[PDB]
């Protein structure tokens, strides 16, 4: 039974049946405001507080200052974790992504990070305007992350709740695990739901499970 | 956590739970005739009248005169406010947008502006056929305004009521906040609803809430 | 309150609440055979008969001879109105076209204008040229009705998904098929700076042109 | 606006006189809806009923095939040809060449009625300018003053009127032929969507293809 | 009164009302596994075993080895019919060149029937499909042989073929469906169109058995 | 009749009425996480442990280590079979497929292999921007047919009731077509397998429920 690392996110370990596979890549996809960024922070936060596992958060759009400010919403002082050397926020914003895939390796080995979060991968391709080389590029990242033995959570974007899993119809096949966050609207009201669509070489709960965002972060309800 | 300024739009400060996050940009998407322009004016107007916060209105298609004429409808004397140096209308009528971002930055400092609104970003990218660089250039704009520390309202256009949030399916991800105006047709009648889809770092009411455009602007109805 | 000119089309002036905003462009979009041309004609016709306001008609496919033949169907004598210099039909069957229109508006002193249809010019960069025309017509200060085509009754407003945002006002004409039967409805989607009735309202085409039925 | 009687049972009722004279009419429809049969009858009825000569223009099917297929309804097209009342123009990037060739036949035969089947096929034989070229034909035919029936093809029954979403706007009139499937069964319906400068009945009307051709039931 | 050629497929000659029109092209479109190949094999097989009519089968993907093996599932020795000269499988695994090879085969074997499975496989050459399909169909008509061309489609109630052009280039059109509803499949055949002649309309239930295709007429 | 080799995957040989046709290619199409890879492993694993039949696995995305690591959860010692020379994982990780067609032909002949799994044929054309698929795939199908190998090729999907594969050509190139579904209704998923087509042989029609237990795929014939 492939080894998993407990995420400690209320409910997720029940749905995943132990947490996220170690050294494997997990895609957390969702429409805007589904809780993709939040999930990836709480994945790094819980690893530091509950198992003293150093974390790397790579951001292509939001700035370290903003990721911190927005985290203070949930009573998390990411400012302190940065000083203590437990967390590292890599800013990869714009002024073959082998230039960046090496910059992350340098931080992982430097900080000795077990957990990694990339948010959001899609933007790199949407910034470079190169929707051709996506399956090849996303694979070079996942593969180079698999060689360092690091448990990774990458977020992607989508336009619909029951349409393609991601934006290019390929990211689901380059990742080991696939988690889908939905914010479905029916009758003028929204319903947040989480779903582990796939986990390679391990069991998990199927279908969508309700969750809500509170002052303590994500809280999923196993049924 | 993140502070927010009151828009003073009847009902909106209840949905948003205090107003719009300060120094962050908010996207207001919608089909044609949903109230995007009204929203961006009422934002700037209220900020000047109730708080003395100066503001800058960026227009791409509509002319300054048209904006002043259309606003007189609600008893808002925008012309007066331009003379006082309280409101400034930047005309951006007719691939990079750095020249634009610098002109907005100049007005902001020249008028000591607190609030800003662009209406509408989409049209700029369509008037130059530069559609493969929207996420790049929109981010450059939203990133600059963040440094200047201005609360910005950007309006975007959509073609469907329950389809993509914006035109190119990217604008939603670059903005900190996302408001969605709707004008749904069902049974040969129209229903106007507003939804705050996302507010980064803060809480807000979820789902779409009804509103109407009265003789005194937008009026939203919270349900709890 | 923005001033409006009465179209004199039965029902429409109730829905629009006085008529079309003066000096602005109004998009009239519809599928094939919805009454786009008819609306454009009736607009100019009623302007001449009811207020002696001269009119200009820009045609991009139908010839002036067919526009007059098709108008005779409703008992209108466009040939007479032309011969009096009260109506001008510019046969165009985008900067060079504006020069043709501006010369005609000034020559005839035309307060109303109809363009049928804008879309065809492109199918024969749409936001740029559409905005060029609409911006120019505004500077001249003429009230315009531009017709536009569509394929679906409840799909895009126009054909490119841009025309709706370039026009100050939008009117959608529908001819919906339900249970092998056709229902004609008109709707004012948007009017910048002024109020109007929302939703679709039933209408018919008779021997006196379009007749809309405002509900309340 | 004057109308000529098509003599197709029911059509002159739905159209309220027939087809606007000197105008072009589009007959759009999916495969096997009866676009060809409609265009043959328009000509045939004109020849036998009013001695109005007819010009049929075919891009795909051969003049021998169009005759062999009509003999199934008891129509002798070979006779109308030998008489010099019907002409079958075999037309198996501009359409100006075709327009001139078509005008030769109209003038030669002193034809009043014309039918083209089908204009879609010429544009795929790859000029997907169709509006510009389809307007060149319609404008010239309107200059000649010949009442024309041009068939067009479509893929969906309740989708676009034609194939390129343009043809319908260039034509003076539009007739949609449908062959809708439901419960594993097919129902044939005809509808006049548009008749410029004149009145007509709205909605779809049932019809069948008998051994005597098209027959439409006008409910009203 | 266009004369028909009996296909000898149980039920089809009732739906078609005599069979397929002689010297015409019949389009048999259908999604994957609807019986397209099987139909075209029975057309030749039945023609040879009953009317002594030599057949020319054209294949662009399938090998003449696999076609003979597949037919042998229904007790059809296409090998023996090949030896006698009554059948001739033309392998076209890699367009006026093919028409010369086909007209050669039809004339060289004094053949009445023809099958082409499938015309979709031939065509990035999509901008000349109508033109090239019309070149073939026109060449086949002038030759004077009854042809059966199969075509592919994606949806059961979507386009009749794969390009929205083959349906009009052909004289006759048969649509084979394999509709899925409630986790079960439902095979039906439909003659959408037959030029110059009458046929039965709508879908008709059919099954594939040890004796080939079996259609159920409701009339 | 067309000869078939038993897959030994519970229920499959009932639906297929004997197994997969010998020397013919079979397409296994499905959305992400439907069980395509798992199906392609169990195929080769069952052939070896039951019939001592050597198999080759052509992997594009997953590494040889992961395919083995993932199989451990079902108690399948894939590492042992690589050492015993009964299984070979061809690492095809990084428009012509000729180099691959010869590498595969080498492994087939060099290991006396009769079963072949290719996971997944769609990824190659995405990784090389070759979206010449009907052209290239036909070369692969034709080659494998000549060599005399029973092949399982998995294709990707986006919709459960839409196109069978990604390009709408792969279904017509293959001799046989299996479809895996993971349909969502009422917030709950449901796994079903379907044999869409089998050239020259009979099979059970429609969708059949299945699950993925501690011993692989289990299908329930109805
Ligand atoms: N004085 C008024 N009283 C009531 N309703 C009004 C008044 N003025 C405008 N409206 C309505 O409110 C709408 C305002 O449109 P606007 O604020 O320009 O929306 P928009 O989304 O910016 N349109 P567009 O720019 O075409 O996308 C109009 O369509 C009118 O129906
Ligand atoms: N303190 C809080 N309490 C409850 N909900 C909150 C709180 N803070 C943020 N949220 C919600 O969480 C959302 C932001 O979560 P986030 O993880 O940024 O989503 P996302 O999918 O990353 N959005 P985007 O980056 O635009 O794709 C907002 O839309 C809020 O509704
Ligand atoms: N003699 C006849 N008696 C009864 N029905 C017939 C007869 N001839 C043809 N039909 C039917 O009527 C249809 C007429 O076909 P046709 O007029 O060619 O339609 P179409 O729309 O032109 N086909 P296409 O050219 O493929 O677009 C045929 O498909 C037959 O089903
Ligand atoms: N005298 C009349 N009485 C009743 N109805 C009429 C009369 N004349 C025209 N119509 C109707 O009006 C329609 C044509 O109106 P028209 O104004 O040409 O529409 P349109 O949208 O411009 N067509 P198109 O130019 O192809 O997009 C026809 O479908 C007729 O049913
Ligand atoms: N002996 C048999 N008994 C019953 N059914 C059979 C038999 N042989 C084949 N079949 C079925 O018939 C189908 C084969 O028909 P075929 O003509 O190959 O379909 P097709 O439409 O040509 N497929 P494709 O070539 O991929 O487009 C298979 O899906 C089998 O289920
Ligand atoms: N050991 C196990 N026990 C029970 N279930 C499992 C086990 N391992 C995997 N699964 C489930 O079975 C599924 C099969 O995965 P897999 O065969 O990789 O699907 P796939 O369609 O190949 N995915 P992709 O490669 O992304 O297209 C996994 O997603 C798990 O949900
Ligand atoms: Cl919530
Ligand atoms: Cl309102
Ligand atoms: Cl009416
Ligand atoms: Cl009938
Ligand atoms: Cl069956
Ligand atoms: Cl399961
Ligand atoms: Mg985010
Ligand atoms: Mg506006
Ligand atoms: Mg018109
Ligand atoms: Mg025809
Ligand atoms: Mg086949
Ligand atoms: Mg896989």
Numbering used by the authors:
A (entry chain B): 17 to 111, 122 to 249
B (entry chain C): 17 to 110, 121 to 250
C (entry chain D): 17 to 109, 123 to 153, 159 to 250
D (entry chain E): 18 to 109, 121 to 153, 155 to 157, 159 to 250
E (entry chain F): 17 to 110, 123 to 151, 155 to 250
F (entry chain A): 17 to 110, 121 to 157, 159 to 249
Please quote the paper that reports this structure:
Substitutions were designed to cover potential structural changes of the C1 ring, as revealed in a previous study by our group14: S157W, to monitor fraying of the α7 helix on the inner-radius side of the hexamer; S146W, to detect the cis/trans peptide isomerization near the ATPase active site; and S229W, to monitor the protomer–protomer interface on the outer-radius side of the hexamer. Therefore, the KaiC hexamer undergoes structural arrangement while maintaining the framework of the hexameric C1 ring. KaiB-induced fluorescence quenching of KaiCS157W but not KaiCWT indicates that W157, located on the inner-radius side of the C1 ring, is a sensitive probe for the conformational rearrangements that occur during assembly with KaiB. Moreover, the plot of 1/t1/2 that decreased hyperbolically with increasing the KaiB concentration is reminiscent of a conformational selection mechanism in which the conformational change in the protein occurs before ligand binding. Furthermore, exchanging external ATP with its non-hydrolyzable analog, adenylyl-imidophosphate (AMP-PNP), resulted in disappearance of the time-dependent change in FIapp after addition of KaiB. According to the conformational selection mechanism, the time scale of fluorescence decay at the KaiB-saturating concentration should correspond to the time scale of a conformational selection of the C1 ring before KaiB binding. Consistency between the 1/t1/2 value of ~0.5 h−1 (10.5 µM KaiB in Fig. 6c) for KaiCS157W-D/E and its ATPase activity (12 ± 1 d−1) measured in the absence of KaiB suggests that an event required in prior to KaiB binding is the slow structural change of the C1 ring from pre- into post-hydrolysis states. Taken together, the complex formation between the C1 ring and KaiB is regulated both by the phosphorylation state and by ATP hydrolysis-driven conformational change of the C1 ring to effect a rate-limiting step of the complex formation.
KaiC is the core element of the Kai oscillator and provides a practical means for studying the essence of the clock mechanism. In the presence of KaiA and KaiB, KaiC rhythmically alters its own ATPase activity, auto-phosphorylation/auto-dephosphorylation activities, and assembly state with other Kai proteins with a period of approximately 24 h (Kai oscillator). A recent crystallographic study by our group revealed that a structural change of the C1 ring upon slow ATP hydrolysis (~11 ATP d−1) is a determinant of the period of the Kai oscillator.
